[model samples]
Target: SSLLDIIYQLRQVPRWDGSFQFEKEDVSQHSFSVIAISHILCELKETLEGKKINKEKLLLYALYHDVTEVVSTHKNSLFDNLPITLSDTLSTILNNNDLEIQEIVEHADHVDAYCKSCIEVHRGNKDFISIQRSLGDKLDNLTKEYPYLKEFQNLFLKDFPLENKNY
Candidate 1:
């Protein structure tokens, strides 16, 4: 029943404006798939260290990361329209008073920057490639420091193939 509810809720959300590659029906499935892939990457990282991350919590965080998007009325068709700085926006909408959520948002912003840089690199901009590499290194350090977050990083790396296939 809960799964059905999640599906129903996800279906109610509008499709992102930037890319037409995915239809509205694909959004929920894509999100779920990305989250699962992230969890697997997290498991891979943890298993290498002979440890287990809090998978349930990690999944929950991934699932809820875009919950605000479900309720957003405005459609920003451009990639720039997406929430680059989500901390304030998420805190306002979700009433999340936790500083940790803000930190998570900051991390997410960094990931976004890395992705954008990678895109520029693909456009044959050698200068932007450095930015991507720098942001990626920061993400790597962040993951190492907070290994619990390997899921989020892994999810972005695995699902979004704009950058490296080595991920």
Candidate 2:
């Protein structure tokens, strides 16, 4: 299935360095990293089964989470400022009836914020709360719609180690 293909392709990409030196390969890597992270989150939820809040919806969410990056490229500042475009494109792609996947890419800012805030929190920088709040708000809304999202929320809400502040 295309889901497996996308996941495999994403796994081959490398991590991003905070530099404009980003090559096509680098962009591909970044896209993959986003997908890979989503996939891992999905698997984690799946393993929990009914033990925790079950939101299998997240598996679809994670798989196509960054599919739009294939066309948008990582250079676009919109990646940070306006992420809804990615989700919109992903929805169209998944709805074309050519794939087995369903559209699950909503709350773009929230997802980005969640990731960024978690990193900042880990670094012991509380200044990122605004961004985190933006993301958390979206997540909070989603959880209201699908209460199972609480499990996903809990994952990021945990405290990070103080020693990793250098990160």
Candidate 3:
């Protein structure tokens, strides 16, 4: 029952909920992109920095990083209303105690947002131009702390808005 509730809730929530967008994006779509980006970031760190991470936990946490938004209306209702068993189970799944992977996931999360904003801007949505700029600044600061993020920007960020993928 909890599992079904979470799935339904996640599906129902829209990302950038109040923002004007040229297209719609939901929590489930955001989570999947975050999951993929998290994996890519971990691989980049291992390859470029010789530092491995607990990628399994990283992916799991990325998947549910915004699970609390399932009850975004009241914001804390999911925890306040659910039985401890379900709440704790969800919390456990969402928590990633690995400090390094946690950092990577955080960067991946922003990267996904930045990518979305980039796509919107490329589609001539001026509304997202500022959003993209803000996210770009955030990613720039993050690059100082995590050079792998810079590497990702260099290698992949440009492709997000490309119309010709084969090119």
Candidate 4:
């Protein structure tokens, strides 16, 4: 199918070749990492919290969040500037006025991004590796705009708590 062809093309689309000196990983690998992180966060959150997340919707969102990058470059994707995707996601999220699937997936994506930066720092390159000491960014505090996202992030008191340094 033509979709398979598109998938194949994405596999060859390189990423992060020399950014902070980390080895390159394709869009597919990055997406897989997001999915993996989403799974872990979702599983752990449900176990600890009385309120349960929409795990199915969360996982599906994680997988497709960056699929647009398969055809368009990462910077060109809808995520970068928050276009149609943001409009639709905002609609879904604001409708429930809670940490809905959109916010859940968003937090998961940021966690993955934060982890990657931290891992590169752990790789022990003072100058070569990318570094983000903080687990979140300025936009991470989505309280005013998206209080639900802020609430979900608050669950991780330790900021990406994990026993192991490497994955």
Candidates in order have lDDT scores of 0.54, 0.47, 0.80, 0.59
The segments of candidate 2 whose C-alpha lies over 4 angstroms from its true place after superposition are 1-33, 40-71, 74-102, 105-109, 124-127, 160-167
lDDT of 4 by residue, 42-82 (tens): 66656655567777667666766665566676622333446
TM-score of 1: 0.40
> For model 2, what is the C-alpha lDDT against the true structure?
0.47
Q: Model 4: runs farther than 4 Å from truth?
A: 47-49, 75-99, 127-130, 134-167
Error of 3 at 39 (Å): 0.2
Q: Write the per-residue lDDT of candidate 3 for residues 37-120, one digit (tens) a residue.
A: 999888988998887677766887888887778766212544666788777766767654667767777888889999999988
Model 1 lDDT per residue over 30-149, tens place: 456546555655565576557766665455565565554555621132223345554434334345444543454445445555655555566666666666677888888888787655
Backbone clash pairs for candidate 4 read none
Worst 10 residues of 2 by lDDT: 15-24
lDDT of 3 at 132: 95
- Give lDDT: candidate 1, residue 98: 48
Best-to-worst ranking by TM-score: 3, 4, 2, 1
Q: What is the Cα-based TM-score of model 4?
A: 0.58
The local lDDT score (0 to 100) that residue 36 gets in candidate 4 is 73
Residue-pair clash count for candidate 2:
1
Number of the top candidate by TM-score? 3
